[PDB]
Amino acid sequence: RYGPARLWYDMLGVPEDDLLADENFLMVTQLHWEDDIIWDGEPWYSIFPIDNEDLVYGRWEDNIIWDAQAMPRLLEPPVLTLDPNDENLIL
Amino acid sequence: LSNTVLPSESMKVVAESMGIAQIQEETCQLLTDEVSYRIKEIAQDALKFMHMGKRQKLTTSDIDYALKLKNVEPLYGFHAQEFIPFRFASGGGRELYFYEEKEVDLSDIINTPLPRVPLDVCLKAHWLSIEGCQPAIPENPPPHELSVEQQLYYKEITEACVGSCEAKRAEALQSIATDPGLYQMLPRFSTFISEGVRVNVVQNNLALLIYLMRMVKALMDNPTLYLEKYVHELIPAVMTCIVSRQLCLRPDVDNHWALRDFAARLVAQICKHFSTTTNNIQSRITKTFTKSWVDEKTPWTTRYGSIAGLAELGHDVIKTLILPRLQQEGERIRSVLDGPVLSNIDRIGADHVQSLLLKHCAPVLAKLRPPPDNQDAYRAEFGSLGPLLCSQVVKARAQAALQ
Amino acid sequence: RLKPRSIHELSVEQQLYYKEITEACVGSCEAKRAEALQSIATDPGLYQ
| B6: amino acid identity, one letter | L
The CATH number covering residue B33 comes to 1.10.20.10
Single out the residue of B215, B148, B159 nearest to residue B186, CA to CA. Answer: B215
User: Do B35 and B42 touch, CB atoms closer than 8 A?
Assistant: no
Count Cβ neighbours within 10 Å for each residue of B99-122 and write b for 16 or more, e otherwise. eeeeeeeeeeeeeeeeeeeeeeee
B206-220 vs B231-243: helix crossing angle, rounded to 10: 140
User: What CA–CA distance (Å, rounded) separates A91 from A89?
Assistant: 6
Collapsing DSSP to helix, strand or coil, A28 comes out as coil
User: What CA–CA distance (Å, rounded) separates A52 from B279?
Assistant: 8
Residue B68 gets which letter from DSSP? T
User: Do B23 and B12 touch, CB atoms closer than 8 A?
Assistant: yes
**A90 in reach of chain C (CB within 8 A):** no
- Chain A residue whose CA is closest to B290: A20
User: Do B178 and B220 touch, CB atoms closer than 8 A?
Assistant: no
**Residue count of chain B:** 403
Contacts of A78 (CB under 8 A, 6+ apart): B191, B194, B195
Contacts of A63 (CB under 8 A, 6+ apart): A75, B194, B236, B240
| C23: amino acid identity, one letter | E
Count Cβ neighbours within 10 Å for each residue of C13-43 and write b for 16 or more, e otherwise. eebebeeebeebeeeeeeebeeebeeeeeee
**Residue count of chain A:** 91
User: What CA–CA distance (Å, rounded) separates B44 from B51?
Assistant: 11
User: What CA–CA distance (Å, rounded) separates B205 from B208?
Assistant: 6
Q: Residue B97: beta bridge partners? A: B88
User: Do B230 and B186 touch, CB atoms closer than 8 A?
Assistant: yes
Chain A residues touching C10 at Cβ < 8 A: 48
Sign of the C-alpha dihedral, residues B269, B275, B279, B281?
positive
Contacts of B267 (CB under 8 A, 6+ apart): B235, B238, B239, B242, B285, B309, B312
Single out the residue of B318, B336, B312 nearest to residue B384, CA to CA. Answer: B336
User: Do C3 and A85 touch, CB atoms closer than 8 A?
Assistant: yes
Given C5, C7, C15, which is nearest A47 (Cβ)? C15
Contacts of B344 (CB under 8 A, 6+ apart): none
Q: How much of chain C is in helix, strand and coil states, percent to nearest 5? A: 60, 0, 40
Contacts of A55 (CB under 8 A, 6+ apart): B228, B231, B232, B235, B279, B281
Q: Residue B88: beta bridge partners? A: B97
> Nearest CA to CA, how far is A8 from chain B (Å)?
6
Collapsing DSSP to helix, strand or coil, B340 comes out as coil
Determine whether B363 is exposed, middle or buried from the number of CB atoms within 10 Å of its CB (0-12, 13-18, 19+).
middle
User: Do B36 and B6 touch, CB atoms closer than 8 A?
Assistant: yes
User: What CA–CA distance (Å, rounded) separates B332 from B58?
Assistant: 87
Say how many CB pairs under 8 Å bridge A and B: 143
- Chain C residue whose CA is closest to A50: C8
> Which residue range(s) make up the domain with B49?
8-70
Single out the residue of B293, B283, B325, B323 nearest to residue A22, CA to CA. Answer: B283
Collapsing DSSP to helix, strand or coil, C30 comes out as helix
Chains with ≥3 Cβ pairs under 8 A against B? A
